[PDB]
């Protein structure tokens, strides 16, 4: 449901707006871009629908759009159009006006459209373009730039700089900049790309009432034009009906399927035109047209019916443009209300000192930034920076780095077919020859088989010409010469090494009759001989009887009924003399007749070699394979059933959906097929149906589905949603123009073409085969373990500098700029790059790393982390407290002023040593990453600044004029510091051992999570409890 809301301006109004929210504060601009409706309503007021200069589209959700006029006042909601009707007073969506109109209407725009009823449809429905507005920087700046933790990060850079804090401000907003300018770069050329790949400018023929015939530009198509299709067949525009001749389109962007299809003129009749029931008479945006057939009239026609964002391109287009973390901006903002409560103890604390005004705001909000770290996304992206210099050493491209860390959460895998799992071609299983009457085995390769009528007729009975020094036509018939080794010299033929032999005469394959048919002869030979090829059912009931045989029909079902694409071929002796003065004179009827069946040729859409290892790889790890495809059925589960995705022993039943016609309601049925548990295998119509009248199956469907076949590229979409729906994390590998609303839609879309697909997707592989599936999902787990492990240390440095400043401003002094400086830049960049570094494990497990950051582990380990840091702080400050040669710190006086001090000193030597245990503590190795111990570089850090600290704390005059740090001159302080650090360095270790290797087993024996939250989950075991389909 949709409602709009009339805004329209008022000048004084306007100005009041602009000065209050620009003269007062930045706040109210920011506020109304987070609320857009108190904004619109201050701004406008309130009008009626039939004046409004401005509407607020509620799908609730808030979108506003202003209303354009050219008269006709219409606005885009999502590049879908709307026009004002003044009867009616209502706004109606473009893609209305002409919807359910009949076939006879569309047979009668067959002579034209008026120019200016083309100038009134193009005002209505637009240009013929599917337009992608490229934002501008700015545009994208105010976009991004605004994002909450910029607007922190920018806080805290002015707080450094009115605190002489110049040195880390500058690096945190150098990060920050260049990040955002980088991103700024990347979006940018994202939808240039897309633009450039929607992009569609051609010449088209259009008719004129008439009879002038005038060339136009595509994007000068209105739903009315009769298009004019080339014979030479091209690129379609537009939807269009056809309302004349035959057409052969290469439909392999709706279907990913690169056969031929036959369109034929719409039937005339009073019933309304439908793209989903009118499919084989319409020609969609995108699919391009072999050849056009005109058999009455002089040329084919075809009226168009969609245009711009109403076609199925549009729809996709559409699609794409307009559609962990969350616990990580929850756990921070728990560390703000800590950031809070922690600055008004140090503005209580402060006064108590005597502090003034101004130093005590800048030291409560400087304690903002300590325990709120401002390098936090940077540090968790540099994790991702490594997976993805990784992914593009292995071949794989991704374009936005943080979508590595979804890769490890998969839970299901959805697979195209042809050219994702199965080869992009077909390829010739073999030929089954005729020996009399009676089928012969299958012969696998062609070419063993002895010099023969049949196999002259697969080397020969094709057109296809030679050019770029490469044999080129339909690829069946170059397969099949490929196959049986001859050379190619109306043409003659050589064999491999076996006479060569010409072909005297050809005539053309025209779909109609469905076969073609050529005659050859060769010296030495009694007489010409004819070769028939074409479909195999036809040609059978052309030849004699007591030729093809009785099994013919169902051995042809068995072949068919696994995807096979079978040709038969048949042989005819000519008792004409052997010239071809009497050959090509020949009327073809005489050839069909009187035939004789050679034999069938067979061939089979391969499997890919990497498919196989890759899917049993995914279902032993527990990964759901899908197969989502715009094949038939058939060949779906004859893939599926072959690649590993339903094991020999699984059970496969078909779900069959028929749409309720007037009388009765909506059925499933449900056929099983012999050779988790089960798998469904149900059809795209069968999909729509489910999802449609049957909401409440659908979940069942979604869960136990393997085999999803005849999808369109929206049901993909569809699918991956609704697949979502279920707290899936669906990973989706497509090849095809078909898959890039599912590439889109989904948590880890892997593209492997370099073509239409690589756009919209965030992984682009190199290689042809899903080797790049398990890649990715190591790649993720990876980097998810070790966004973990960097989140974890970024939350414990931060709680520990929490902790030291805290202490310190109890008792009137502070780190100092060189500490702070040296904790912040020195200790943790270091840190949190080489935490980010080690790869992942070279084997996929069938477990995958959390999700949550709010884990009772990942908060337990936080918690006792930081009792132990807490423990080893003040230890360590209160036994500087007990000793001799202390002396206070002269409080009347703050710091830096103070400083050096044996507090600060004490505090800096233990805190400092903590930073570089806990980077070490938080750090794992197995099971998703490579052992801690193969670091070296992270390990030879930890040793350098370790022991660069430790020469800070013995070393006496070391690097104690810069720090700022008090020579402790009693030699047992310090041991007792080390060994008091040496017991965190312990501790932290076997905290972390502990907890990971008992809580689990705790948790499980305590509290028995007995129900997941996950909705697949809970179907998954609801099914094991009562099976859906009995
Ligand atoms: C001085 C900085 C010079 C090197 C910056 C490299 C920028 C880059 O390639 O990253 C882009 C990516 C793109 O991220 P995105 O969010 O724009 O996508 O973002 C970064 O710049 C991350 C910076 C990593 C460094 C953080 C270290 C701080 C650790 C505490
Ligand atoms: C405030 C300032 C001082 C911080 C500066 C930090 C940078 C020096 C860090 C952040 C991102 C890091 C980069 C993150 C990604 C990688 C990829 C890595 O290469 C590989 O991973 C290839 C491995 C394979 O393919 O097998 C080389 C290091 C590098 C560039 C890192 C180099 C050091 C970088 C530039
Ligand atoms: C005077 C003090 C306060 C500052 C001294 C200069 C710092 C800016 C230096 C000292 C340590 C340097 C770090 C030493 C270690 C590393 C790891 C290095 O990463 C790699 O080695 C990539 C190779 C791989 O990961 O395989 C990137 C630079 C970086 C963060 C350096 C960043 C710049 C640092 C912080
Ligand atoms: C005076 C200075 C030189 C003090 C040096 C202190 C060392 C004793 C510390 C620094 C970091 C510590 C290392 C930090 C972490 C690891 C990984 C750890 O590996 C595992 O536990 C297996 C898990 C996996 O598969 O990754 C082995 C110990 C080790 C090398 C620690 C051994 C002792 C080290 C080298
Ligand atoms: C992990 C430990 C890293 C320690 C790295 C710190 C090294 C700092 C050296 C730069 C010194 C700057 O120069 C020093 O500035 C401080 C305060 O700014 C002055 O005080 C000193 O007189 C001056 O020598
Ligand atoms: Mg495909």
Redesign the pocket.
């Known amino acids: 449901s949709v409602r709009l809301s009339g805004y329209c301006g008022s000048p004084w109004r306007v100005i009041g707006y602009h000065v209050v929210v620009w003269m007062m504060a930045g706040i109210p601009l920011l506020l109304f871009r987070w609320k857009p409706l108190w904004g619109v309503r201050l701004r406008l007021r309130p009008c009626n629908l039939a004046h409004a200069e401005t509407l607020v589209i509620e799908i609730w959700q808030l979108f506003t759009v202003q209303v354009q006029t050219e008269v006709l006042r219409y606005y885009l909601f999502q590049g879908q159009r709307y026009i004002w009707i003044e009867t009616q007073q209502a706004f109606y969506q473009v893609s209305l006006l002409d919807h359910g109109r009949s076939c006879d209407d569309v047979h009668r725009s067959r002579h034209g459209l008026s120019l200016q009823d083309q100038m009134v449809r193009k005002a209505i429905y637009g240009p013929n373009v599917i337009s992608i507005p490229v934002k501008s920087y700015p545009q994208l700046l105010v976009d991004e730039a605004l994002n909450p933790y910029y607007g922190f990060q920018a806080f805290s850079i002015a707080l450094w700089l009115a605190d002489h804090y110049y040195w880390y401000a500058l ?1 945190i907003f ?3 900049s ?3 300018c ?2 700024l770069y ?1 979006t940018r050329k994202q939808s240039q790309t897309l633009r450039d790949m929607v992009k569609l400018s051609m010449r088209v023929c259009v008719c004129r009432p008439g009879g002038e015939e005038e060339w136009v530009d595509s994007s000068e198509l209105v739903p009315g034009d009769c298009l004019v299709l080339p014979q030479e067949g091209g690129l379609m525009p537009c939807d269009a009906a056809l309302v004349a001749g035959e057409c052969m389109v290469n439909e392999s962007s709706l279907t990913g399927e690169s056969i031929p299809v036959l369109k034929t003129a719409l039937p005339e009749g009073l019933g309304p035109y439908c793209a989903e029931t009118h499919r084989r008479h319409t020609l969609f945006c995108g699919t391009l047209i072999l050849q056009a057939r005109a058999y009455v009239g002089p040329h084919v026609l075809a009226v168009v019916t969609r245009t711009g964002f109403c076609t199925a391109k549009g729809g996709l287009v559409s699609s794409i443009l307009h559609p962990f973390y969350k616990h990580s901006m929850k756990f921070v903002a728990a560390l703000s209300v800590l950031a809070l409560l922690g600055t008004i103890y140090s503005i209580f604390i402060l006064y108590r000192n005597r502090v003034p005004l101004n130093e005590i705001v800048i030291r409560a909000l400087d304690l903002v930034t300590v325990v709120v ?1 401002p ?5 968790m ?2 994790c ?2 490594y997976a993805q210099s990784r992914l593009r050493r292995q071949g794989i491209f991704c374009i ?3 979508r590595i860390n979804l890769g490890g959460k998969l839970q299901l895998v959805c697979f195209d077919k042809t050219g994702t799992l199965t080869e992009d071609g077909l390829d010739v299983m073999g030929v089954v020859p005729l020996k009399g009457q009676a089928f012969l085995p299958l012969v696998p390769e062609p070419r063993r088989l002895p010099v023969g009528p049949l196999l002259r007729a697969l080397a020969t009975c094709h057109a296809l010409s030679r050019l770029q020094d490469t044999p080129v036509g339909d690829p069946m018939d170059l397969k099949m010469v490929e196959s049986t080794g001859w050379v190619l010299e109306d043409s003659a033929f050589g064999t491999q090494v076996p006479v060569p032999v010409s072909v005297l005469h050809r005539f053309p394959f025209s779909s109609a009759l469905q076969r073609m048919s050529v005659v050859v002869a060769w010296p030495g030979a009694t007489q010409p001989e004819a070769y028939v090829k074409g479909s195999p059912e036809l040609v059978a009931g052309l030849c004699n009887p007591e030729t093809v045989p009785t099994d013919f029909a169902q051995m042809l079902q068995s072949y068919t009924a696994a995807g096979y694409r079978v040709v038969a071929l048949a042989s005819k002796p000519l008792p004409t003399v052997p010239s071809l003065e009497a050959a090509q004179q020949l009327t073809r009827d005489t050839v069909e007749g009187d035939l004789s069946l050679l034999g069938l040729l067979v061939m089979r859409n391969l499997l890919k070699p990497q498919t196989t290892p890759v899917i049993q790889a995914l279902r032993r790890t527990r990964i759901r394979a899908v197969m989502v495809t715009g094949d038939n059925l058939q060949t779906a589960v004859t893939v599926a059933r072959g690649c590993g995705m339903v094991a020999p022993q699984e059970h496969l039943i078909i779900v069959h959906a028929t749409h309720p016609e007037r009388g009765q309601p909506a059925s499933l049925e449900f056929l099983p097929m012999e050779s988790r548990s089960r798998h469904l295998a149900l059809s795209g119509p069968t999909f729509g149906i489910i999802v449609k009248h049957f909401p409440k199956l659908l979940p069942k469907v979604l869960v136990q589905g393997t085999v999803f076949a005849r999808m369109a590229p929206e049901q993909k979409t569809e699918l991956v949603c609704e697949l979502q729906k279920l707290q899936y994390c669906v990973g989706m590998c497509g090849d095809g123009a078909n898959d890039c609303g599912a590439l889109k839609a989904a948590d880890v879309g892997i593209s492997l073409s370099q073509a239409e697909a690589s756009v919209v997707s965030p992984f682009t592989s190199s290689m042809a085969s899903i080797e790049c599936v398990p890649m990715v999902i190591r790649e993720g787990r990876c980097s998810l373990d070790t966004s973990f492990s960097v989140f974890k240390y ?1 939350a414990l440095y931060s709680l520990t500098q929490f902790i030291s400043v805290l202490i310190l401003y109890t008792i009137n002094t502070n780190l100092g700029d060189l500490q702070f400086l040296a904790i912040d830049l020195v200790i ?2 270091t ?3 080489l935490m980010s570094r080690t790869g992942p494990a070279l084997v996929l497990g069938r477990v995958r790393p959390p999700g949550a950051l709010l884990s009772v582990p990942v908060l337990s380990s936080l918690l006792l982390q930081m009792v132990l840091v807490t423990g080893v702080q003040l230890g360590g400050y209160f036994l500087t407290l007990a000793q001799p040669w202390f002396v206070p710190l002269n409080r009347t006086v703050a710091a830096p002023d103070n400083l050096p001090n044996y507090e600060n000193t004490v505090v800096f030597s233990l805190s400092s040593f903590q930073y570089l245990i806990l980077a070490a503590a938080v750090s794992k190795g197995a099971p998703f990453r490579r052992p801690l111990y193969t670091n070296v570089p992270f390990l030879v850090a930890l040793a350098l600044l370790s022991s660069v600290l430790v020469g800070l704390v013995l070393v006496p005059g070391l690097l104690q004029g810069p720090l700022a740090l008090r020579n402790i001159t009693d030699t047992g302080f310090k041991l007792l510091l080390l060994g008091l650090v040496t017991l965190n360095f312990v501790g932290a270790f076997m905290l972390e051992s502990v907890l990971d290797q008992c809580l689990p087993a705790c948790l499980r024996r305590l509290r028995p999570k007995r129900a997941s939250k996950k909705r697949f989950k809970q179907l998954e075991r609801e099914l094991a409890e009562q099976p859906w389909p009995p």
């Open positions: 690096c150098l990060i920050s260049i990040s955002i980088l991103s990347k770290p390098a936090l996304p940077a540090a992206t540099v991702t920076l936005h780095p943080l970024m943790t960049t840190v949190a790059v």
